[PDB]
Structure formats: C-alpha cells, structure tokens
Amino acid sequence: TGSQQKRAFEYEIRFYTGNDPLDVWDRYISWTEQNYPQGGKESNMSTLLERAVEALQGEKRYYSDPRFLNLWLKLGRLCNEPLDMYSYLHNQGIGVSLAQFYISWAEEYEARENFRKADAIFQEGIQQKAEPLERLQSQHRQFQARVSRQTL
C-alpha cells in the first residue's frame, strides 16, 4: 500500500505524458513527507530529492517555480553545510525572485546566531522585491523582534 503508492509514482515518472514533470516529483515528495512525517530510512527522501534535482537540473523554466525551490530547500536541510546550497541557488539564480528563498536562507544564519548575515539576506530579498514582498517584510520585522528579545 505504501509499497503500491511508491511503485505508482515510479511508473508515473517513466510514463508521464504531460509537459510539467515537476508535478510528478512534487506529488511524490509531498506524499513521502505526508507518509513519513518524522523521516526514516524507509522514506527514501534524501535519494528522492537527489533524483528529482538530477532529472530537472538546468530547467530554467522552473527557476522561479516554488516547487522547484522546495526540492532544493528540502535537499539543503540534509546537507552537512546548508549554506553551500543557498549560495548555489543564489549563483545560479534559482528562487531569487521568491521571498521563501530569502526567508529560509536568513533562517539558517539566524539558527547559527549569525544575526548580521541573516539581516543582510533579508535586506537583499527586500531590495530585489522578492515575492510576496509583504510576507518577506513581515518576516523581516519578526526576525528583528526575535533578536531584540534575545538581547534584553
């Protein structure tokens, strides 16, 4: 049943007749987190992410798609040094028009208590008017409140 759904996805990757292959990967990834909420070796997540990126790599039509960004962000969280992934996306122009990119990037710096670089990431996202801008600005404001709270 788990077995059956995984097999169905694997066959869909092969036989998909549409023009948006990211859809198959995106549904396969989200079924996988729906069904393995705290991960596990049986989830196959990290290998699924690697396979998804490998299949869609260099597909620039997707560089601004949030499902694409998602694959990379999920992959990055499973890397020894998530900053390598953020900088990569940044160099390649993947996700650079999305607020979520800057939010997650800024969050990684905030988690290490590198508040100054977290702030700079927000500032760049905002200058680029990354979307949605109001969500990005709201998120920035609350990042600032968290820092203030930690310095009283």
Binding site: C79, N80, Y88
Partner: peptide
C-alpha cells in the same frame, strides 16, 4: 557527525559528471 548527511559540493560535482 558528517556520517549520513549529504555532501553538497560532491552532489554538484556528481551532477556535472553525467
């Protein structure tokens, strides 16, 4: 510990290898 985590730079290298 590194153990099970992905090596990002290695991954990117692997993609280029074909």
């Amino acid at each position: 510990s590194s153990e099970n985590k992905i090596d990002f730079n290695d991954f990117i290298k692997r993609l280029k290898t074909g």
